[PDB]
Amino acid sequence: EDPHLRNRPGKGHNYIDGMTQEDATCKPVTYAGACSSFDVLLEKGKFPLFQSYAHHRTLLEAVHDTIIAKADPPSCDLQSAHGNPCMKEKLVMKTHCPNDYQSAHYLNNDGKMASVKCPPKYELTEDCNFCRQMASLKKGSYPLQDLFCQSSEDDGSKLKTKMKGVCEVGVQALKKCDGQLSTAHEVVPFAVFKNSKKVYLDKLDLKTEENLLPDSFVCFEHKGELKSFDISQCPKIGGHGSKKCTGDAAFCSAYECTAQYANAYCSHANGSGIVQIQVSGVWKKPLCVGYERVVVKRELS
Amino acid sequence: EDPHLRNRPGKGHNYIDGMTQEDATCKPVTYAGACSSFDVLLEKGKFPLFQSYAHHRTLLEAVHDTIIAKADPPSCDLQSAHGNPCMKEKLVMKTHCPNDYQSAHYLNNDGKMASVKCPPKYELTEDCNFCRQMASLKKGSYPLQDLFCQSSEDDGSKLKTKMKGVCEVGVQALKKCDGQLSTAHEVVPFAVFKNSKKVYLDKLDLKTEENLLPDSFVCFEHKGELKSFDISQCPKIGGHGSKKCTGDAAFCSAYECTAQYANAYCSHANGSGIVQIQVSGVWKKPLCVGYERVVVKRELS
Amino acid sequence: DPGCSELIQASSRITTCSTEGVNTKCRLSGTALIRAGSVGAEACLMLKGVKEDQTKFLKIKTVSSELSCREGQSYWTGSFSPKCLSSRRCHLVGECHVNRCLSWRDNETSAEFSFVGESTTMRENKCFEQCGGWGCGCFNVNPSCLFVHTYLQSVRKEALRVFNCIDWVHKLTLEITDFDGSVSTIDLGASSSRFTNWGSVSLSLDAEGISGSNSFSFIESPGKGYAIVDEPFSEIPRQGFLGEIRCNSESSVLSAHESCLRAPNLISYKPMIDQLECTTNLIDPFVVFERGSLPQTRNDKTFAASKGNRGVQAFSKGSVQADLTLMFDNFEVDFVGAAVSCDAAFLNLTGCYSCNAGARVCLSITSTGTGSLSAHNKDGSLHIVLPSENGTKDQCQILHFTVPEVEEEFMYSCDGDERPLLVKGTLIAID
Amino acid sequence: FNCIDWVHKLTLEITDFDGSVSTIDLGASSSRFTNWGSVSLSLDAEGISGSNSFSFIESPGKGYAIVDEPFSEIPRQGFLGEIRCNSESSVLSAHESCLRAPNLISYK
Amino acid sequence: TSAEFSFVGESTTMRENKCFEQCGGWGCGCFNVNPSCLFVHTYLQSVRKEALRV
């Protein structure tokens, strides 16, 4: 298919310290240069949420855009066992790597970037947890979470886990329980507000307002690399503006199109713009919302 | 499915006496093993009991489990004169023996491993009672009884055959009958406890009680086919044993995972447990219970 | 309390004996008949070998007269709660079409809800059209779409099973004691058969039952007491009826399995453009479980639960008149002639005469070895069997009599020599 | 629209402990999720039966009405509801999703 | 014929095969949340030592 989803707005950087020597091609993310930390997010039948929202930012891109901070240490060392920063946040998580990988990133409870690391020459197991001994060596990180990040300024760091009826989910201990619990791997979403923690979600009710905002489109440089272009510079219909713009019928039906005489080509994106969510009965604009298969200990007896 | 057909927990040795032609192809028993004394146990349309209870122990595996002693002699000769210990218990069989075989092992009344063997290069007949002239010849023996064994230790020196109203079954002398003998070939089960005699039954009632047991976990080496790895070499959490171990969330939660220090990946299994038996109304733990086809004499009047 | 009440001798046609190891053992290859005892009485079976001292007995202790049930059509139910998700999409976006939204199927996952996860519950997919234009938050003038993904879950930590009864089977819990001393507790109802070590047993005569059981539905609770509802069995589950959501197993209710039967178009919806409050007006069975909790008073019977074995029973206040069939599957009965001595003494004799409960008798058996005692009267209709060991114990049983002034001579022994013994006691008249 | 069972609704203005005021409502046995939890009814009474033979008319921002006739089931000629739709936009814009009576538009 | 009782054989005795739904998970003796099975092999046996021709 046409790799039109590789054009990432803003910076589009996918590299972390420790390992991953493919930063020469993953910085930025364009058509040329194979990036193992992004090619797995385009294959159908795996992460449909990121494919539906493939017009915003990822986790690493949010880290390189002054949104998500870096944890200490940013890469857990799996050489010394019997205690490591990547134990409770990964043992309960149920993922599946297509082998031939060493690095894998996820989200911590604080709200930073916590990733594992296999020193060369090791390999990740079928559950992406611990390393193992030894085709090709893909040093890139594997997205363990189907999350999407964007830009927002709405404050909301005074909210914790909204789930009610679960003793211990993932890593947060809401209440102590010693009786029989319904231990089962369920798919529970999560959200992160402005400088908040791992706020678990009981239900997902999104809201996208498709308007004339630059975040609701993917304007790039007209061809006949590619970065994000501000749509505000496009002239209005029946008027005059600064630069020139063009697009399909969805874009030409609102602004002015000059076809080849345009310095940028715009197109209507699917699922992009201001994304809201329901929490405590009040609409709020989060930052990074995704899913994860963690161990949920529901009450029973 | 059924990923535990050829994997044998615990020991897993199918060595036979006399027919010493497969000592290096039966110890241990892995997935890619080529042991003649185990291939016919999973054949479609032969031994359904072993196919239903695959995650257990066999006769030879019970002999090599330091719980069942071998017979003297362990390999009987069918070309003898008078006074053959392996003749009265072998001629009364009804189970048809396939071709391309030379040896045949079974269980005697005392509870020892008894087997027969033809002189080279002879094979078995249709009733596998004598020895006649010779696909390819098997390098081992043939299981004559469809039985499964496990790890038990209950005594059974006071329990005898509970077949009421039966004249003489197999080779045992039960009670004296007053009517005419009725010779009929039927299927009568047999139960042998820890150091006891061959106790026959009439209505075999078997139940399975599974719990957190170390026999409910399998392991296999990495691959950059499958291999074999004992589960008893995995210590508890927060400690160090003899060999290194690792697994997924279902294995690291109970046992300590050494990450890349191990050379075998372990998964979650289920099929062991504590199998009981209905003997004299009291549920006991059987050692080697199964079925045997012998001559059963009943009363006609 | 033990004690032989109805005693009968087995026929010689189905009684054959032999000899093996200086012992005279006998087997039975037939079936005898004996009257069923009342509450406390027993139905012993005298087994004669070749002489007099070799006499065995099979005690059948009757607990009480009960009436079991026969379950036919059953189902599990419980409380639930809806949990729906909302997602609004403008027109000309993905699959936003009012023609497709109007005839949207429930078993078809939309493109905006394929990232939910493993949900093996009673899930459904609905759709409702809303507004559009710039006033609602869209670019096209055409109205927007609102895909609805509703799935049910389990919120109650317990469940209830609703069943009915078609015929009150008169069950008699019998405690059959073997000849050697093995005690086995079984149950027999109407004409049902079981499986014992000595063969099989089944109830014969049965003249006790309660009519009109189809118009009554029962509720079973795991562990706690049962319930009773005064209405016929629930037919088709519809809206506004007790039992609109049913399953098949307990795990299908405690975990909300998709293989359940629910009422169609039951989950309500509140289309509010962006918000959508989905609630269900389910029927709470705990109210009926609390209003009609066993035990209750229905007509002249007592409806209650049952201990040990799960099931509903019905206590009666009538007589006990039934027959038992002791089917022997050719089982040998051995007996070793003991040689220990004993010196029994009479204690008291309280009870009733010409009564179905019998009179209680007690003796002061004092022996020096572990064995058994075999006694008999003069004409041949009364027998006393009581265990004996080294020491001094007081064994008691129940003996039937038809006279308030019992003056019958007994002949008890423990090795061979029989000695006389006289008993006495005043009895009362009990119907 | 019509009515099949009158539900006793009670509009509740729940005020939290901090001072936030929230106005909600409850009916029959429905439950709404609030900030501190959820509230629902436990016992209801006073019900009005026999409402299937009446039809109400809702107007946007005007008022309600009552009609003394059974509810319109199938659209036909000579009866209320000859051309029915699904939403207000389907009426103000005349969409194909609307249901009309067969052979209703006459011709000369 | 069920696989858990196929060792008996397809004889001329009145037989039947039933199956009931039970419970799974570690609370009952399994590993998965799906319910377990219950293979039933019922065969009739002659109780009376004689027959009657009505």
Author numbering:
A (entry chain Q), B (entry chain O): 154 to 287, 290 to 379, 393 to 469
C (entry chain R): 688 to 1118
D (entry chain T): 850 to 957
E (entry chain P): 796 to 849
Published text:
While the Gc glycoprotein is responsible for membrane fusion, the role of the Gn remains undefined.
Single-particle averaging and 3D reconstruction yielded a 13-Å resolution reconstruction of the Gn–Gc spike envelope. We first performed fitting with the localized reconstruction of the pentamer at 7.7 Å resolution, followed by fitting the resulting Gn–Gc heterodimer model to localized reconstructions of the hexamers at 8.0–8.6 Å resolution. Consistent with previous biochemical and structural studies, this fitting verified that the Gn and Gc assemble as heterodimers, which form higher order ring-like pentameric and hexameric capsomer structures on the mature virion. In toto, our integrative structural biology approach reveals the shielding of the Gc fusion loop in the pre-fusion state by its partner protein Gn.
